[PDB]
Design a protein around this motif. Sequence first.
Motif, short mmCIF file in Angstrom:
data_model
loop_
_atom_site.label_atom_id
_atom_site.label_comp_id
_atom_site.label_asym_id
_atom_site.label_seq_id
_atom_site.Cartn_x
_atom_site.Cartn_y
_atom_site.Cartn_z
N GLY A 136 1.47 -1.11 -0.85
CA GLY A 136 1.38 0.22 -1.53
C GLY A 136 2.76 0.86 -1.55
N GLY A 162 3.53 3.39 -1.05
CA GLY A 162 3.37 4.78 -1.48
C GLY A 162 3.64 5.73 -0.34
N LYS A 163 3.86 6.98 -0.67
CA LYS A 163 4.13 7.98 0.35
C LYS A 163 2.90 8.15 1.23
CE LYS A 163 2.32 11.85 -2.33
NZ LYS A 163 1.73 10.92 -3.33
N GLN A 208 1.11 6.38 2.20
CA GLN A 208 0.26 5.26 2.01
C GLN A 208 0.69 4.18 2.96
OE1 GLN A 208 -2.44 4.33 -0.07
NE2 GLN A 208 -2.68 6.51 0.13
N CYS A 209 2.00 4.03 3.05
CA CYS A 209 2.60 3.04 3.92
C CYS A 209 2.41 3.42 5.38
CB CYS A 209 4.09 2.87 3.59
SG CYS A 209 4.60 1.15 3.86
N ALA A 221 0.35 5.60 6.69
CA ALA A 221 -1.07 5.66 7.01
C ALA A 221 -1.63 4.26 7.16
CB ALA A 221 -1.83 6.40 5.91
N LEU A 222 -1.08 3.33 6.40
CA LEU A 222 -1.55 1.96 6.45
C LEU A 222 -1.33 1.38 7.85
CD1 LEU A 222 -2.75 -0.45 5.19
CD2 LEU A 222 -0.55 -0.98 4.14
N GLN A 250 -3.31 3.86 10.41
CA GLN A 250 -4.74 3.64 10.34
C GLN A 250 -5.12 2.39 11.12
OE1 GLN A 250 -6.71 6.62 7.86
NE2 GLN A 250 -7.15 5.23 9.51
N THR A 295 -8.13 1.81 7.58
CA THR A 295 -7.17 1.69 6.50
C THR A 295 -7.88 1.78 5.15
OG1 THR A 295 -7.27 -0.67 6.00
CG2 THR A 295 -6.19 0.00 8.06
N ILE A 296 -7.09 1.84 4.09
CA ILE A 296 -7.64 1.93 2.74
C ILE A 296 -8.23 0.59 2.33
CG2 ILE A 296 -7.11 2.54 0.38
CD1 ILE A 296 -4.55 3.82 1.46
N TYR A 343 1.96 -4.69 7.55
CA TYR A 343 3.03 -3.71 7.56
C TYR A 343 4.41 -4.36 7.73
CZ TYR A 343 6.21 -0.11 8.94
OH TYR A 343 7.32 0.71 9.02
#
Length: 37
Positions: free
Chosen positions: A1, A3-4, A6-7, A9-10, A13, A19-20, A32
């Motif tokens: 991702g 993404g802001k 997003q990374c 949190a990944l 999480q 996680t998403i 990661y």
Amino acid sequence: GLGKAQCAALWLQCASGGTIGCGGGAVACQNYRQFCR
Ligand SMILES: *[C@@H]1O[C@H](CO)[C@@H](O)[C@H](O)[C@H]1O
């Protein structure tokens, strides 16, 4: 991702397993290093 948040949190999480990706977030942790060095 990459993404802001997003990374971050990944990885964060993966601490609890929410996680998403949803599903065996266990592997999400290593993902990661591969995505975000
Ligand atoms: C995470 O979300 C996916 C699809 O939304 C589902 O297949 C998994 O069971 C769930 O843990």
